[PDB]
Design a protein around this ligand. Structure first.
Ligand SMILES: C/C=C\C/C=C\C/C=C/C/C=C/CCCC(=O)O[C@H](COC(=O)CCCCCCCCCCCCC)COP(=O)(O)O[C@H]1[C@H](O)[C@@H](O)[C@H](OP(=O)(O)O)[C@@H](O)[C@H]1O
Ligand SMILES: CC(C)CCC[C@@H](C)[C@H]1CC[C@H]2[C@@H]3CC=C4C[C@@H](O)CC[C@]4(C)[C@H]3CC[C@]12C
Ligand SMILES: CC(C)CCC[C@@H](C)[C@H]1CC[C@H]2[C@@H]3CC=C4C[C@@H](O)CC[C@]4(C)[C@H]3CC[C@]12C
Ligand SMILES: CC(C)CCC[C@@H](C)[C@H]1CC[C@H]2[C@@H]3CC=C4C[C@@H](O)CC[C@]4(C)[C@H]3CC[C@]12C
Ligand SMILES: CC(C)CCC[C@@H](C)[C@H]1CC[C@H]2[C@@H]3CC=C4C[C@@H](O)CC[C@]4(C)[C@H]3CC[C@]12C
Ligand SMILES: NCCc1c[nH]c2ccc(O)cc12
Lengths: 45, 328, 219, 276
């Protein structure tokens, strides 16, 4: 079990952090919760 | 020895934390949200809620034996499915919206069909193979469904056949929460052992181990990228674990909170995540800065469940007052 | 606003709300009870007596009053994660067998620990507890054949029946730390049948009356 | 001189209105207070608010000016509204007493059938009685109420004396039931039982004493005066200050009923804390 689990492509944790930051900043424009959407196009009005 | 080797490897791989990278990132600031819709149809406590694929219909289960499918626009009721067992602890919504699932203290994740020629909701399937109270059964496709039990096991079920195909074992404490990846190729489960197991559906065996909590974990949610998920515990210290790094990254803790957490969820882009504590307040934690950016109120007793729409248009939260609040 | 489909949807929602409200009113006027105890302390015997694979919901009808009893002992698991859902129950029925000294899984100590843990639960502060003692006869023969010193190292006295029963009763009544909020009702279960149901009904009525008086401030 | 009493009257009606409005708002905005008894309490608060908003200001104006300057058309409306609202407020106490008696002595009815329709019917009956006590005189420089012997006795017996006995009997039965319930190594148990019994008896006695004594000492003098004065025409030289105080006691009860019924109980103040 653990023998095969050990053999895995190991990447830097900083690389994972950078990837997460890139993903967060890539789709930040399409976040209605992040930026307050005005009532004009908000379907909750 | 192998556990020590894994611990040493992860410690060596821990060269820097996300805080240093996110230090230069400006904070999201104050996030002001108000209850724009109020759904009051239930009469007892509710413990589950799941949004639809079209970000219009959502399903919620209550303890009065009734399940209500609400319209997020007109606040109307489209269906009302009575439950044979009044004790329901979880619910799920099919990706295509053709089927619904419900599970609780009874060892059954019943499947209900919504669209039929007769036009009347009726029981579709009754999966009864578990020996413990169910925690969370979630749909993978229109043909497959996973189940989380209260007897240290998780099994994959085929709807038409009714017999489980794969069974997972290895937990000491009962599993509480289960979340599915966006691609429906793998999932991670959590148990009261202060640890989480990653499970692969196609092969059907565990892959990797997470630890770090001191008490039981109540909720788990996958990051939108699908390479990480956040775990909540009763110690009021949510921990985010990355499937790539395979190690703890940051902790969401505050001295002002002493009560545990019930449900967690992420946003469409994953920049901000929601958290439902036992203080009838939901905290809008920032994914990067790990700070508190928003406060939600309006619940009397406790927040039980909350979920974000696929489109990210709004977020819904459930409490023990039979009131569903739609925040945006 | 001038849409026929919107009016139809509103009518459907109103019908659904009417159905939900009437069903909730129907399900509100029925007492909910709880059953707790060991696996083989006589719980199933009590269920059979009153009426003659998870939660077993059984319905009773006695003197125009409906009872819902939830036998949760069928499935064994961590009590912390499913005991909070039973808040608001009118009363809790606790079953423990007197003749538990011979059987060793010790059993009496485990039963007392379980009773102490459940009674002092944060969710059952205002919940009354009904305690039932089963198979008194077998306890009688066991005491006639075995001493009482093995079970209680700190107790010494005559090996009689009534005194031993009173000692057990008061020791069970002493486990609870809070006494002003909840009151424990102990009973002796015998071969009789109607007595158990009558005692349960009387306990439920007394609990309801005391709750009403507390709401009125006279108790 | 006029300002000294005017300020006190203004404060009295202001605080009565504030209390009644707060009670009504708390009942309305709370979903956990939507109980059958709370409906009766809210109806009582609404009646008291009507008394404080409509009747009390004109009574204070009459009291300070010592004369009616608004004419007979307004005098008739004032008298009718005063009688109707006061009778409705008085009968709500008896309605609440009956509801409590049913809840305590009939637990089966409480569990099986106790819906808001019962409170609605009780409120409707109380308002019907109040109307029946107010319309007869209309259909039959001082704005004095009619002092006909037959009408006086009928109104007094239908407003105070009938409910007085129907309330005394009900709380007597409730007290008997409460005493029966309360009454029904060794040193610890004995002392605990004695302490619990004495504490519960003192609590119930204090509650019943407050509830009955406030109502008695605030209404009985007024109705006694109303039932004595019209039947003794020869002797009508009573002091004015005593009559004014006795008359104003009934109005002052408007701010006392919500305190007795609404503010004291732990749940209502908890709701107040939550909303605050
Ligand atoms: C001769 C010597 C002996 C004789 C006298 C001395 C010894 C005896 C004293 C008699 C008591 C004097 C009056 C004080 C009563 C008193 O102590 O009040 C207690 C504590 O509250 C506060 O004090 C706190 C105060 C809270 C007030 C609410 C806040 C708002 C007030 C302003 C409202 C106006 C602005 C809106 C609580 O009230 P309580 O002691 O009377 O106990 C009960 C009360 O009688 C019941 O009404 C109530 O329910 P009910 O039956 O339906 O009516 C019960 O729940 C409970 O409250
Ligand atoms: C004419 C003078 C005395 C002013 C009094 C106006 C009264 C009638 C007004 C003020 C506030 C109002 C109430 C406030 C909120 C509620 C709760 C709701 O669920 C039903 C209606 C009800 C009860 C309203 C009905 C009418 C009301 C009682
Ligand atoms: C959920 C529902 C059943 C709540 C019930 C509340 C109803 C029954 C209560 C609340 C306040 C009450 C009203 C308040 C005051 C008035 C004005 C009076 O001149 C006639 C009666 C009337 C109109 C009362 C009748 C009954 C009433 C409307
Ligand atoms: C009429 C209004 C304005 C004033 C009301 C005064 C009230 C507070 C007075 C009148 C008589 C008093 C009561 C008379 C005797 C008893 C019984 C005793 O065992 C406890 C105190 C108790 C209950 C007293 C409490 C306060 C009391 C109720
Ligand atoms: C205990 C409290 C809260 C309620 C009772 C307060 C009483 C004593 C107050 C309220 C209004 C007051 C009265 C209002 C106006 C008059 C008319 C005047 O020509 C003599 C005094 C007199 C009669 C006042 C005396 C005291 C009074 C009656
Ligand atoms: N403010 C009290 C008015 C009132 C109510 N009921 C009454 C009965 C008889 C009477 O003279 C007067 C009244």
């Amino acid at each position: 079990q653990l023998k095969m689990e050990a053999n895995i492509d190991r990447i830097k944790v900083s690389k994972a952090a950078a990837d997460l930051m890139a993903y967060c900043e890539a789709h930040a424009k399409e976040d209605p919760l992040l930026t307050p959407v005005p009532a004009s196009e908000n379907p909750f009005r | 020895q192998l556990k020590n080797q894994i611990r040493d490897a992860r410690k060596a791989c821990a060269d820097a934390t996300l805080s240093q990278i996110t230090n230069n990132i400006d904070p999201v600031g104050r996030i002001q949200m108000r209850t724009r819709r109020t759904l009051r149809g239930h009469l007892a406590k509710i413990y589950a809620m799941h949004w639809g694929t079209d970000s219009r219909l959502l399903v919620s289960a209550s303890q009065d034996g009734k399940l209500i499918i609400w319209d997020s626009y007109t606040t109307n009721k489209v269906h009302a499915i009575p439950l044979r067992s009044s004790w329901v602890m979880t619910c799920a919504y099919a990706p295509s919206g053709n089927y619904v699932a419900c599970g609780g203290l009874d060892n059954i994740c019943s499947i209900y069909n919504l669209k039929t020629r007769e036009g009347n909701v009726r029981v579709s399937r009754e999966l009864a193979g578990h020996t413990g109270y169910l925690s969370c059964c979630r749909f993978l496709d229109d043909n497959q469904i996973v189940t989380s039990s209260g007897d240290t096991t998780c099994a994959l079920w085929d709807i038409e056949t009714g017999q489980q195909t794969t069974t997972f074992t290895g937990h000491t404490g009962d599993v509480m929460s289960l979340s599915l990846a966006p691609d429906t190729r793998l999932f991670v489960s959590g148990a009261c052992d202060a640890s989480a197991k990653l499970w692969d559906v196609r092969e059907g065996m565990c892959r990797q181990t997470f630890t770090g909590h001191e008490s039981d974990i109540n909720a788990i949610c996958f990051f939108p990228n699908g390479n990480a998920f956040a775990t909540g515990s009763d110690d009021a210290t949510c921990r985010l674990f990355d499937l790539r790094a395979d190690q703890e990254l940051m902790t969401y803790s505050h001295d002002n909170i002493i009560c545990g957490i019930t449900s967690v969820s992420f946003s469409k882009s994953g920049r901000l995540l929601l958290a439902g504590y036992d203080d009838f307040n939901c905290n809008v934690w920032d994914a990067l800065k790990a700070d508190r950016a928003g406060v939600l109120a309006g619940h009397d007793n406790r927040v039980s469940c909350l979920g974000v729409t696929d489109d990210g248009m709004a977020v819904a939260t459930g409490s023990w007052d039979s009131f569903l609040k739609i925040w945006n | 606003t001038l849409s026929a489909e919107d009016k139809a949807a509103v009518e459907r929602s109103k019908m659904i709300d009417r159905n939900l409200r009437e069903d909730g009113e129907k399900a509100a006027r029925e007492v909910k009870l709880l059953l707790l105890g060991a696996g083989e302390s006589g719980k199933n015997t009590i269920v059979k007596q009153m009426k003659i694979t998870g939660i077993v919901e059984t319905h009773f009808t006695f003197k125009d009053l409906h009872f819902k009893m939830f036998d949760v002992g069928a499935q064994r698991s961590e009590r912390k994660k499913w005991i909070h859902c039973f808040e608001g129950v009118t009363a809790i029925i606790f079953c423990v067998a007197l003749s538990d000294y011979d059987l060793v899984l010790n059993r009496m100590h485990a039963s007392m620990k379980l009773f102490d843990s459940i009674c002092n639960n944060k969710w059952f502060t205002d919940t009354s507890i009904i305690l039932f003692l089963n198979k008194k006869d077998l306890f009688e023969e066991k005491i006639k054949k075995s001493p009482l010193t093995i079970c209680y190292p700190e107790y010494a006295g005559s090996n009689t029946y009534e005194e031993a029963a009173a000692y057990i009763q008061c020791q069970f009544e002493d486990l609870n730390k809070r006494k002003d909020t909840k009151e424990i009702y102990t009973h002796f279960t015998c071969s009789t049948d109607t007595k158990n149901v009558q005692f349960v009904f009387d306990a439920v009525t007394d609990v309801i009356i005391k709750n009403n008086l507390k709401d009125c401030g006279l108790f | 001189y006029q300002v000294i009493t005017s300020l006190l009257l203004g404060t009295l009606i202001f605080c009565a209105v504030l209390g009644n409005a707060c009670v009504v708002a708390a009942i309305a905005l709370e979903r956990s207070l939507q109980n059958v008894a709370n409906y009766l309490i809210g109806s009582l608060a609404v009646t008291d608010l009507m008394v404080s908003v409509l009747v009390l200001p004109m009574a204070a104006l009459y009291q300070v000016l010592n004369k009616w300057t608004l004419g007979q058309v307004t005098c008739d409306l004032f008298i009718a509204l005063d009688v109707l609202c006061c009778t409705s407020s008085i009968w709500h106490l008896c309605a609440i007493a009956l509801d409590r008696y049913w809840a305590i002595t009939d637990p089966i009815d409480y569990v099986n059938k106790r819906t808001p329709r019962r409170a609605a019917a009780l409120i409707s009956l109380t308002w019907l009685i109040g109307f029946l006590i107010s319309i007869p005189p209309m259909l039959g420089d001082a704005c004095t109420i009619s002092k006909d012997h037959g009408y006086t006795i009928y109104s007094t017996f239908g407003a105070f004396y009938i409910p007085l006995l129907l309330m005394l009997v009900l709380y007597g039965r409730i007290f008997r039931a409460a005493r029966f319930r309360i009454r029904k190594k060794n040193e610890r148990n004995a002392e605990a039982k004695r302490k619990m019994a004495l504490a519960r008896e003192r609590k119930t006695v204090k509650t019943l004493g407050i509830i009955m004594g406030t109502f008695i000492l605030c209404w009985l003098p007024f109705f006694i005066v109303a039932l004595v004065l019209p039947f003794c025409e020869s002797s009508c030289h009573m002091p004015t200050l005593l009559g004014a105080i006795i008359n104003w006691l009934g109005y002052s009860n408007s701010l006392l009923n919500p305190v007795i019924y609404a503010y004291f109980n732990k749940d209502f103040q908890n709701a107040f804390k939550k909303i605050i």
